[PDB]
Design a binder for this molecule. Structure first.
Ligand code: PC1
Ligand code: Y01
Ligand code: Y01
Ligand code: Y01
Ligand code: Y01
Ligand code: Y01
Ligand code: Y01
Ligand SMILES: *[C@@H]1O[C@H](CO)[C@@H](O[C@@H]2O[C@H](CO)[C@@H](O)[C@H](O)[C@H]2NC(C)=O)[C@H](O)[C@H]1NC(C)=O
Ligand code: NAG
Ligand code: K
Ligand code: K
Ligand code: K
Ligand code: MG
Lengths: 294, 994, 33
């Protein structure tokens, strides 16, 4: 039966229909076969990797307009806290503190790597070509003091203790990408802000019509006077040619929100290069929902 | 139990009685019958004279039983978990994501469609009792209240008196008391059309062989008779045969037992992979939504979704191939059964013979001439030149009471109906086909005085005028039984000359008679005399009550012999069946002399091999002084089956090789079929009549004869030979063995592609890598690109000559074994999986994700709210930007599986031979090869497919990433077949040959 | 422009191939009658 006949019929010394040598020979065949397949797989992977350039990817069409993100890494684009409760905004302030670690001036004091760049937004910096033909490149350095009233050299809660919260907006790193700000016809973009030919402009407004009258005043902090990304930093060369690269940031503070209402806010960059999408709700644009309970 | 009781002989003891015991056992006074006060009371006491159909299950129960057939259970589980995932998805936060709803709807529809396919394959419940209900008349002829009246035949009781005339059907079973010789036709019991003279006297202990029992469903075709009813309805002999044949179950076809073995194997592997990797997803702390999505993806990857529809379509193509050879196949699963058969239990009359008595041999002029007994005149003739041929043509054409019917002359000679008896129409058709018309000779030789066959004188005689130059002026001609004919003859006819009688010719005459009687054939002798004109003038008339013409006719013309001959194709077909390993057993209702002669003629009993009685006659020994293991052929009379035990029948079937059963009952052929089936055999049964209809129902496959077959046997059969060509049987064996070899290949083609469908989900949970393949693109592999290349393998030819092989063992020798599993899953499937993983790594490396960087990236990649994921070059990606790259990898994995299935289709055509020896002469294979790639390129490059299926366009150099893996598959299987061919019993043949 | 790929050319070439391969395979199948 299934007790003694099929498992361990021992008049011919067989376990599941096979002797000892009939087990050994098929196991040796299978380990040799799978070893040869693993060898062929590793060899074809290495011959494929010999076609890959280590300074620039082969295709860059799937990151072709970059994305816009904000630094308190939240879970459903929601920010909800009570300002007289130092446990509700703890994860927000801790995430902001862990991000701005490498922006402190005690981390940018090498001089063979960092360099004092300008103080006005300027033209992009071309450092040559992508081919190690000049080894490691230098990085313009970003002062934390330019994020004023949203840096840490003040109150250490970034505004969350006193009502008014603040977010840090950044653009996704794309290798070799230079953003083009919108050209002057004095009309083109929307609606009106202070035009600079060396700033990629960024605006944060209310989403619906009922949120435009409830978001209150908005403050921008960054390099310069006009709110956006300065173009000095922007030809990024990769983490092989530029480790310790610091991308420029833009701080946005909401000083006069209304209480006990979930407010929906859209932030958006404008350029000739910046594209949008109805399927990707983070391409060149993002949305956030802020509620301050009191 | 009760149908186990139905397989016994019928007990009467009515025929052993006399006119007094019947007067008190049934109360019927034998002259007046019954009054209606007693008859209408016994009718309510006992039951009507009718049959009743069995309980039949309706069509929707038999269809909704197909919706739980093994693979359908795992797919119902998958369809339930898809709706569970959708409800836990879109009723907590995400108001998008109707993806897991359509997937459940698709999986629910796949079960319904494959259930329709498996319902078409089902074995077609037919209506035997409805054709048993047509051999009953509508009117009986009863004698009640002292007179006669014609009532409905359903209102006959057990005991009243029936009167039958020639032309009626018989309403019940009758013990008869007065008949002036009516002849019934007992073909429903014995399969013989020769009529039996019924008589009111007891003649034999067995009630099926006695003269005083008329039976149900037969017909008395002469005279008249009066009988008393002994059985009505379900209690009659043929009613019990109908009950047995409609109560005999179907039985499981051998092809269905092969399907319900790999359903078990594949379900075991699928359930093990599904429930062992679902608890790993709970140890490593997934969420419930991700755990059930992983379970769905591992269930769909494991079920070969389109496989049972492929088997149904391949069997339908083979059945349509067989239908152009005039071989209609009713139940589809009986396509395979004729290939794996090991024992053919054939019927003799109507199946092996032509069921028409015709002239076999003659004995002109001290020499034996053989005729051509073939229905299409395939053989050659005998003689048409000598004078005694024209003389005996005259004699056999003029001493004949038979005649043609009402002008059906356009239909040819051997099939025209006659009006006389068959034994004389056998002479009439030979005279008509070999010497022109007979009516011209019958009018030119005018008849003056005749007297037909008197049953105590053994001849039939007539006087005919000769109108030509010979002029005996009323010549004499007669015919009769041979020894009583040469009792009274002294002049012999040799080439038209007269010679005297010496025993020089007479012991030669008895030599020819003994040799003709050793062929099982009916011989009779013919005579004539040239009358003189000393006592017999012109215009004289003879009278039929006295002697005034000579009854001492010194005549000697010759002997003519008759037989039921074999068909044209049966002697070659029996040899073809025996050369393929099939044991052919004859089972018949005829007497053993004609049975053994026919069985030696068709070749069931071969030369040299002879029975026990031939030994005891060759050595002049009593038969109980010779060892029964000496002979290898046996002829078992059916009356000795009655006292036989079930294990003596096993001895008969075990120790002999050429078996003949004779005088078999309708119930005893069922005993013989079950006795062959009991010691592990697949038994085909061929038949024509109603007395083979139980044995056609018990067998693995029943083959009925089309033209000459009864309406009952055409309902109890699985095949119908639509032109009565028995050599189609051999053809049905050959394409039975071929489709069983063509199925394996297609099954192997459909199993290999399972492996580059399962291993994407395993490496997803072992290595924590972004998921290389989705569930929709798994469904598009099998339900799409795999159907036509698997169906195309059913057109492959045989590699060797398959009719030299023995039949397959049912217990060993499976359809799917451990070697097909090892070859499909363990060897070719792993190369097919590495071919897809290489293409997966290529696209991610070319967009900036190097292969060492992808390990452990699964949680951040799947996160909807992390919109900066760093790649190997430092670029940051949003969530919808990298999902497009993932769906491109899904499309390319699909394309890679399509590319490796080209080489998989090419290596699966042959199992031992090469592609350079067999060729590429299969056009539907090349059509499948083209259309699979056409469908893949259409799905990849069509506009709008990124929404409906989440399929994306491929860049042109990504179509070539799986070419070295197809080349490896091809050269590996060619080298494997070379080692199989050059070492014909070694290790590679023991491990990798299916 | 490294941030642009022409997908319409590859799409048109794939659809031309998908039509031609199907017509050729059907001509191979329906050889005579
Ligand atoms: C691009 C490559 C194409 C070619 C690659 C294919 C090479 C291998 C051929 C395919 C089938 C596998 C055959 C190899 C083993 C055959 C051994 C043999 O000759 O049997 C006879 C020998 C001798 O026995 P035998 O043949 O005489 O049989 C005994 C019975 N009598 C005596 C009657 C014949 O078999 C053995 O004794 C033991 C065999 C088991 C050996 C243990 C495994 C060996 C490892 C080989 C694996 C090779 C696969 C590499 C994977 C390739 C990657 C694609
Ligand atoms: C039939 C089934 C079981 C086979 C499919 C399993 C795959 C072979 C698995 C095994 C581990 C996986 C991969 C994990 C990462 C490695 C890195 C790679 O080695 C390198 O990183 C090269 C870097 C260098 O050049 O130094 C070797 C192959 C590869 C892609 C593996 C390729 C095959 C994967 C998908
Ligand atoms: C992705 C690519 C690299 C793999 C595709 C594999 C092809 C299926 C290969 C396998 C062997 C090749 C061929 C090698 C030579 C034979 C001869 C031919 O034989 C004959 O028809 C001659 C007539 C006869 O011998 O009866 C059978 C098909 C054919 C073309 C083969 C058809 C399939 C080819 C092109
Ligand atoms: C040992 C056997 C099984 C394979 C060894 C011979 C193969 C013909 C080699 C030669 C180069 C290999 C590959 C090198 C590049 C890949 C990816 C792709 O080509 C590219 O790499 C272009 C990518 C780029 O331009 O960056 C398509 C062809 C393919 C699969 C090649 C297929 C053939 C490989 C495996
Ligand atoms: C090598 C043996 C096995 C025969 C190969 C059969 C394949 C179906 C072949 C036929 C032609 C090949 C390809 C030739 C070029 C086109 C490019 C592509 O269309 C275009 O990109 C056209 C635009 C352009 O090329 O500029 C659609 C698929 C593809 C890769 C073809 C897909 C099918 C390939 C791999
Ligand atoms: C018979 C076949 C089907 C199974 C064997 C194929 C294996 C999947 C091969 C493919 C590549 C091999 C290995 C090559 C070296 C790497 C490095 C190893 O450690 C590292 O991650 C690199 C060190 C580090 O950066 O931490 C991770 C797995 C591993 C990919 C691979 C695991 C899988 C191996 C054994
Ligand atoms: C990789 C995933 C998708 C599953 C596919 C892997 C194969 C199923 C593996 C599992 C273990 C392997 C083999 C391990 C050794 C046995 C010996 C042998 O089994 C027997 O014949 C003994 C019983 C008997 O002979 O009666 C053939 C099948 C075989 C099971 C296995 C066939 C399947 C192999 C190649
Ligand atoms: C940044 O925060 C400081 C708080 O220290 C704000 O400075 C105060 O602004 C109000 C209104 O103008 C004055 O009445 C106070 O005297 C200021 N205090 C000091 C110490 O300067 C400052 O306005 C904020 N910057 C903005 C909102 O742009
Ligand atoms: C918020 O305060 C600013 C201060 O000038 C004022 O202009 C604005 O109207 C206020 N918004 C609301 C919604 O009260
Ligand atoms: K599957
Ligand atoms: K049957
Ligand atoms: K499959
Ligand atoms: Mg018959």
């Amino acid at each position: 039966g299934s007790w003694k006949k099929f498992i361990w019929n021992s008049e011919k010394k067989e376990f599941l229909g096979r002797t000892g040598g009939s087990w050994f020979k098929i196991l040796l065949f299978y380990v040799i076969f799978y070893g040869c397949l693993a060898g062929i797989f590793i060899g074809t992977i290495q011959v494929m990797l010999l076609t890959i350039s280590e300074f620039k990817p082969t295709y860059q069409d799937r990151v072709a307009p970059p994305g816009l993100t904000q630094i308190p890494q939240i879970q459903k684009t929601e920010i909800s806290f009570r300002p007289n409760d130092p446990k509700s905004y703890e994860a927000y302030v801790l995430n902001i503190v862990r991000f701005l670690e490498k922006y402190k001036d005690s981390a940018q004091r090498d001089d063979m790597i960092f360099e004092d760049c300008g103080d006005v937004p300027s033209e992009p910096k071309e450092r040559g070509d992508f081919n190690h033909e000049r080894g490691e490149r230098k990085v313009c350095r970003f002062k934390l003091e330019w994020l004023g009233n949203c840096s840490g050299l003040n109150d250490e809660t970034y505004g969350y203790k006193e009502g008014k919260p603040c977010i840090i907006i950044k653009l996704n790193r794309v290798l070799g990408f230079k953003p083009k700000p919108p050209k002057n016809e004095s009309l083109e973009t929307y609606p009106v802000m202070k035009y600079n030919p060396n700033v990629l402009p960024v605006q944060c407004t209310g989403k619906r019509d009922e949120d435009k009258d409830k978001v209150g005043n908005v403050e921008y902090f960054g390099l310069g006077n006009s709110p956006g990304f300065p173009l000095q930093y922007y030809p990024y060369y990769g983490k092989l040619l530029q480790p310790k690269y610091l991308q420029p940031l833009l701080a946005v503070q909401f000083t006069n929100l209304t209480m006990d209402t979930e407010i929906r806010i859209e932030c958006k960059a404008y350029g000739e290069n910046i594209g949008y999408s109805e399927k990707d709700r983070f391409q060149g644009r993002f949305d956030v929902k802020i509620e301050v309970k009191s | 139990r009760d149908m186990d009781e139905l397989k016994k002989e019928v007990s009467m003891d009515d025929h052993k009685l006399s006119l007094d015991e019947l007067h008190r056992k049934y109360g019927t006074d034998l002259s007046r019958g019954l009054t209606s006060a007693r008859a209408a009371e016994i009718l309510a006491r006992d039951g009507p004279n009718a049959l009743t159909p069995p309980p039949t299950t309706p069509e929707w129960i038999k269809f909704c039983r197909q919706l739980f057939g093994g693979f359908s259970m795992l797919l119902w589980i998958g369809a339930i978990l898809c709706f569970l995932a959708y409800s836990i998805q879109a009723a907590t936060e995400e108001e998008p994501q109707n993806d897991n709803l359509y997937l459940g709807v698709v999986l629910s529809a796949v079960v319904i469609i494959t259930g329709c396919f498996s319902y078409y394959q089902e074995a077609k419940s037919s209506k035997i009792m409805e054709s048993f209900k047509n051999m009953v008349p509508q009117q009986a002829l009863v004698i009640r209240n002292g007179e006669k009246m014609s009532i409905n035949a359903e209102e006959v009781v057990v005991g009243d008196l029936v009167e039958v005339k020639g032309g009626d059907r018989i309403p019940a079973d009758l013990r008869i008391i007065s008949a002036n010789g009516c002849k019934v036709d007992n073909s429903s019991l014995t399969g013989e059309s020769e009529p039996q003279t019924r008589s009111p006297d007891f003649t034999n202990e067995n009630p099926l062989e006695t003269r005083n029992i008329a039976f149900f469903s037969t017909n008395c075709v002469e005279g008249t008779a009066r009988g008393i009813v002994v059985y009505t309805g379900d209690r009659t002999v043929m009613g019990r045969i109908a009950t047995l044949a409609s109560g005999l179950e179907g039985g499981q076809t051998p092809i269905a037992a092969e399907i319900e073995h790999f359903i078990h194997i594949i379900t075991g592997v699928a359930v093990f992979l599904g429930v062992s990797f679902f608890i790993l997803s709970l140890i490593l702390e997934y969420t419930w939504l991700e755990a059930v999505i992983f379970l769905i993806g591992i269930i769909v990857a494991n079920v070969p979704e389109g496989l049972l529809a492929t088997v149904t379509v391949c069997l339908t193509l083979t059945a349509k191939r067989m239908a152009r050879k005039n071989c209609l196949v009713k139940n589809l699963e009986a396509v395979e059964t004729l290939g794996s058969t090991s024992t053919i239990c054939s019927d003799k009359t109507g199946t092996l013979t032509q069921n028409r008595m015709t002239v076999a041999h003659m004995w002109f002029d001290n020499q034996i001439h053989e005729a051509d007994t073939t229905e299409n005149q395939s053989g050659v003739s005998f003689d048409k030149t000598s004078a005694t041929w024209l003389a005996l043509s005259r004699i056999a054409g003029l001493c004949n009471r038979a005649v043609f019917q009402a002008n059906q002359e356009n239909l040819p000679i051997l099939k025209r109906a006659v009006a006389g008896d068959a034994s004389e129409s056998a002479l009439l058709k030979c005279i008509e086909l070999c010497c022109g018309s007979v009516k011209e000779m019958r009018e030119r030789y005018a008849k003056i005085v005749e007297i037909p066959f008197n049953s105590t004188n053994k001849y039939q005689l007539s006087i005919h005028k000769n109108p030509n130059t010979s002029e005996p002026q009323h010549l004499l001609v007669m015919k009769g039984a041979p020894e009583r004919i040469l009792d009274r003859c002294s002049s012999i006819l040799l080439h038209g000359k007269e010679q005297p009688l010496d025993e020089e010719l007479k012991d030669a005459f008895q030599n020819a008679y003994l040799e003709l009687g050793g062929l099982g054939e009916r011989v009779l002798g013919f005579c004539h005399l040239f009358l003189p004109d000393e006592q017999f003038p012109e215009g004289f008339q003879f009278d039929t009550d006295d002697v005034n013409f000579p009854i001492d006719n010194l005549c000697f013309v010759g002997l003519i012999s008759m037989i039921d001959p074999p068909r044209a194709a049966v002697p070659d077909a029996v040899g073809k069946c025996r050369s393929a390993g099939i044991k052919v057993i004859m089972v018949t209702g005829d007497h053993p002399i004609t049975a053994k002669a026919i069985a030696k003629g068709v070749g069931i009993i071969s030369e040299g091999n002879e029975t026990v009685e031939d030994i005891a006659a060759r050595l002049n020994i009593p038969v109980s002084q010779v060892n029964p293991r000496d002979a290898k052929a046996c002829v078992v009379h059916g009356s000795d089956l009655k006292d036989m035990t079930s294990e003596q029948l096993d001895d008969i079937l075990k120790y002999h090789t050429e078996i003949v059963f004779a005088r078999t009952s309708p119930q005893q052929k069922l005993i013989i079929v079950e006795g062959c089936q009991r010691q592990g055999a697949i038994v085909a049964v061929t038949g024509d009549g109603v007395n083979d209809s139980p044995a056609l129902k018990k067998a693995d496959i029943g083959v009925a004869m089309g033209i000459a077959g009864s309406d009952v046997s055409k309902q109890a059969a699985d095949m119908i030979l639509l032109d009565d060509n028995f050599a189609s049987i051999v053809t049905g064996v050959e394409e039975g063995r071929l489709i069983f070899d063509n199925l394996k290949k297609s099954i192997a083609y459909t199993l290999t592609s399972n492996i580059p469908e399962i291993t994407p989900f395993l490496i997803f949970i072992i290595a924590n890598i972004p998921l290389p393949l989705g569930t929709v693109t798994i469904l598009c592999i099998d339900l799409g690109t795999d159907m036509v290349p698997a169906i195309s393998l059913a057109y492959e030819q045989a590699e060797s000559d398959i009719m030299k092989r023995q039949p397959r063992n049912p217990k060993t020798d499976k359809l799917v074994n451990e070697r097909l599993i090892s070859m499909a899953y363990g060897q070719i499937g792993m190369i097919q999986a590495l071919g897809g993983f290489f293409t997966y790594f290529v696209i991610l490396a070319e967009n900036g994700f190097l292969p060492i960087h992808l390990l452990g990236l699964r949680v951040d990649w799947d996160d909807r709210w992390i919109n900066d994921v760093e790649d190997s070059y430092g670029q940051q990606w949003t969530y919808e930007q990298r999902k497009i790259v993932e769906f491109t990898c899904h499309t390319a994995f699909f394309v890679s599986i399509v590319v490796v299935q080209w080489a998989d289709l090419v290596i699966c055509k042959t199992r031992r031979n090469s592609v350079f020896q067999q060729g590429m002469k299969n056009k539907i294979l090349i059509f499948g090869l083209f259309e699979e790639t056409a469908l893949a390129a259409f799905l990849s490059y069509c506009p709008g497919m990124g929404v409906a299926l989440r399929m994306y366009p491929l860049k042109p150099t990504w179509w070539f990433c799986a070419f070295p893996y197809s080349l490896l598959i091809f050269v590996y299987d060619e080298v494997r077949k070379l080692i199989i061919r050059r070492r014909p019993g070694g290790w590679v043949e023991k491990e990798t040959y299916y | 422009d490294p941030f642009y790929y022409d997908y319409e050319t590859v799409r048109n070439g794939g659809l031309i191939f998908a039509g031609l391969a199907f017509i050729v395979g059907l001509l191979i199948l329906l050889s005579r009658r």
